Every structure is written in C-alpha cells, then in structure tokens.
Amino acid sequence: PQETLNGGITDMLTELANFEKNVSQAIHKYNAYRKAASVIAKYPHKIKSGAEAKKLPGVGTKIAEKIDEFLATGKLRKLEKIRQDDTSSSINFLTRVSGIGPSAARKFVDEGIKTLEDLRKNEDKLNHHQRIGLKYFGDFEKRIPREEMLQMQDIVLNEVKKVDSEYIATVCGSFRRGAESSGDMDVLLTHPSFTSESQPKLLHQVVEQLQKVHFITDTLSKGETKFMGVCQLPSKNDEKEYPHRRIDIRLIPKDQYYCGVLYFTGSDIFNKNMRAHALEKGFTINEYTIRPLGVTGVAGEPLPVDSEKDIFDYIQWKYREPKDRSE
DNA sequence: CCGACCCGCATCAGC
DNA sequence: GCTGATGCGT
DNA sequence: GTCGG
Ligand code: NA
Ligand code: NA
C-alpha cells in the first residue's frame, strides 16, 4: 500500500524504534516498534483511530495511544522532545557509523565527540572497525542495485572457482529472492572436505584471492568461518568510481549447507512459517539441521540433507522457488 | 503478573 | 599470559 | 512494547 496511507504513523514508529535501540538500549522495545510499523505498512487502509490499529498483531495499548495523539495533532510530544535533545540526537547519529553501537556512542558524546568532524579529529580513539565505518560513512548507507550485485556475484563466483573448482558458493539474501536492490552481499560457502566431524585455510584462500585481484579492499573481521569486510567494483577507467560496499562470507560444513542456504535466503516471515509447519509435522528446523521429534518431544539425530528440496520433502511441502519465498 | 522476545569475532575486564 | 564478559553486527 | 502461559 502507498506510503502516503499510514506513512506518518510508520515514520513515527520507526523513529521511536531507533531511540529504543540506540539511546534506551532496549532491543526488544526496538523490535516491537519495528514489528508494529511493519504490520501497519501492510495494512491496506488509512488508519482513522488507534483503536482500529489495536486489532492488528503487534499493536498494543501504548502504540494505539500514540496513533491517536498523532492523528489528532499531527505529532507526538515525546518524539518532538527527543528530536531537539542535543545529547539524544548526537548519540542516535553516531550509531550510524558501522562499529559504533549504543555503548560507544554514549561514551563519545559523554566527552564532546558528537559529529563525524569530531571523529575525524580523534582517530586515536577509534578501533579498526570504527575507522573503516567512518572512512566509508556515506558509501555504506547507499543501496546496491542488482546490476551491480550481479557484477559483484560474477567476480566472487569466478575467483572462488579459480581457487578450487569443488568450492560451492551461493550469494543468498534478498538478492536470491530477486530483490531489485540490496544493502550488502552475503556469500555462503562450502567445500566437500569440510563437514561437521571434519582445513583452517579454506576461508582464507578465498579471501586472499579476492584481495589479490583488488575486489576486497578492507577487513572488519576475519576468523576461520566468518569474514566481514569491504569490496568495490573496478572503475570504468574513465567513469566515476563505484562506492565501497559491505560483503560477508561464511564457511559452512557441507552437511549443513543447504539448511544454511535456505535460512539465509529467507524471508524472515517465510522461515517462521516453515519452522511452524515443520513442528506440526514432527520435525524441528534451525539454520544448521532438520531433526525429527519423538513422541515426547526429544529431538533425534539430524537427517541427511543434500539440497533445499530434501528439506521440503521431509516436511511434506512442494519446493518453493526463492522467488516465491516472500512469506 | 511476569518472562520471552535468535552466534563469530574483536576487544576489554579480571585473574 | 589465559578465560570469560561484553559490544557489535548480522 | 506486545503477547501469552
Ligand atoms: Na493488537
Ligand atoms: Na553502528
């Protein structure tokens, strides 16, 4: 439904949510607000009262009272006050740097560090992740169009295969469901020599190869099974340079790969329904394995998975395309 | 009423 | 020095 | 903040 329907309500709830996350440090409060703002974004009617809203799942008494104040007056007193509060807005603004969470934001602002400019003046006080988040502040807030993602997926699949042709790599995320744009790249990776009961360089070889060809430009973190960093498509030799982008690469045991691909493909709503259905059938699905449930509820040993379909077959479903996993 | 609401890595706190 | 807590991102 | 045992 058009954002003009309840966009004033959903912008209010999203602002309220950011302050819970970044200033209050109440992640559950943040998620209720985001939930309610989501269910209202999909409600196909211009809400006329807080009471109409309360019917919907995730909207309770406090959010029903805020919609009523917002409908009658056009604003929310408590939000208007938080917006003009110099400590709050500075803390909320600082968490937009990757690597600065609510705790570091509070400490920076507690000593006069309030802006990018102050950060640029105080690099001695930033860990490695935050220097990188500061360096690429604007680029990281930009979205990535699918044409760039296809180009980036090209480079990742080619260099992975260039390191070892038995590697299996799957760019998951909303990009695998067909999304027209993305906010980062999530690569899931496996090798037949790596299993649940099975070298600690499989990830490193692929990261190193992507660095040697100058696709990966920086590293936020890297261990034996997760790499988080920065990449960038090469310049056109005469055009503007592309903005640096975020990219994650996980190495997963081959016996849990398709469980992991299914999970990190999503959506989050689709995953819940499939987990919900799988229980009413006597199976438990998480991001690693699918296991059967005894009559008392005790899980059994994980069942063999060798594709996404294998999982669907177990729980008596017909394979759903990633395209159709919107819910 | 009142508890639930979903791990890998960098860094720090304590020993 | 090592082990465990915490912050952070996802 | 919302839900539910
Ligand atoms: Na409700
Ligand atoms: Na941040």
What is the CATH classification number for the domain harbouring A52?
1.10.150.110
Closest CA to A218 of A228, A226, A205, A209: A228
Give the end of a domain, one of A248, A263, A278.
A263
Residues A55 and A162 placed together within one structural domain of the fold: no
Closest-lying ligand to the alpha carbon of A105?
Answer: 2
Same domain, A286 and A312: yes
Q: Which ligand is nearest to the CA of A55?
A: 1
Residues making up the binding site of A for Mg(2+): 184, 186, 248
Nearest to A36 by CA among A61, A19, A73, A72: A61
Q: Spell out which residues have Cβ within 5 A of ligand 1, the ion.
A: A 54, 59
CB of A126 within 7 Å of some strand B atom: no
**Number of structural domains in chain A:** 4
- List the CATH number of the domain containing A310: 3.30.210.10
Residue A181 and residue A144 in contact, taking contact as beta carbons nearer than 8 Å: yes
Q: End of a domain among A44, A69, A85?
A: A85
Helix residue ranges per DSSP H, chain A? 7-19, 27-41, 50-54, 61-73, 77-84, 86-94, 102-109, 116-121, 128-135, 137-141, 146-163, 202-212, 257-265, 268-279, 308-314
The binding site of A consists of 54, 56, 59, 95, 97, 100, 143, 174, 177, 183-184, 186, 248
Q: Comparing C-alpha atoms, which of A9, A8, A30 is closest to residue A19?
A: A30
Q: How far apart are CA A98 and CA A233, in angstroms?
A: 21
User: Which residues lie near nucleic chain C, judged by CB under 7 A?
Assistant: A 95, 97-105, 129, 133, 184, 186, 228, 246, 248
The residues of A that are catalytic are 66
First-last CA distance in chain A: 17
**C-alpha distances in Å from residue A16, one per residue of A22, A28, A29, A78:** 10, 12, 9, 9
| Residue whose tokens read 């949510």 | A17
Q: A267: cis peptide before it, omega within 30°?
A: yes
Which nucleotide is closest, CA of A59 to its C1'? D2
Q: Confirm whether any atom of chain B, the nucleic acid strand, is less than 7 Å from CB of A28.
A: yes
The answer to whether A61 CB is within 7 Å of strand B is no
Q: Which two tokens stand for residue A120?
A: 């640029």
Same domain? For A73 and A114 the reply is: no
What's this structure's resolution in Å? 2.5
Q: Which residues of A are annotated as a binding site for Na(+)?
A: 54, 56, 59, 95, 97, 100
Burial of residue A82 (CB within 10 Å: 0-12, 13-18, 19+) is: middle
CB A273 within 8 A of CB A327: yes
Statement to judge: residues A222 and A321 lie in one domain: no
Check whether residue A24 has its CB closer than 7 Å to nucleic acid strand D.
no
The partner residues of A206 in beta bridges, in order of sequence, read none
DSSP 8-state class, residue A249: E
The C-alpha atoms of residue A90 and residue A188 are separated, in whole angstroms, by 36
Last residue of a domain, one of A41, A70, A85: A85
The answer to whether the C-beta of A205 is closer than 7 A to strand B is: no
Strand partners, A228: A221, A248
Sequence letter at residue A72 = A
Q: Is the CB of A62 under 7 A from strand D?
A: yes
Co-location of A182 and A217 in the same domain: yes
Domain that holds residue A289: 264-326
Q: Which method, experimentally, gave rise to this model?
A: X-ray
The domain that holds A148 is classified in CATH as: 3.30.460.10
Whether A133 and A193 map to the same domain: the answer is no
Taking the C-alpha atoms of residue A325 and residue A327, their distance in angstroms, rounded to an integer, is 5
Name the closest residue (CA) to the C1' of nucleotide B5. Answer: A28
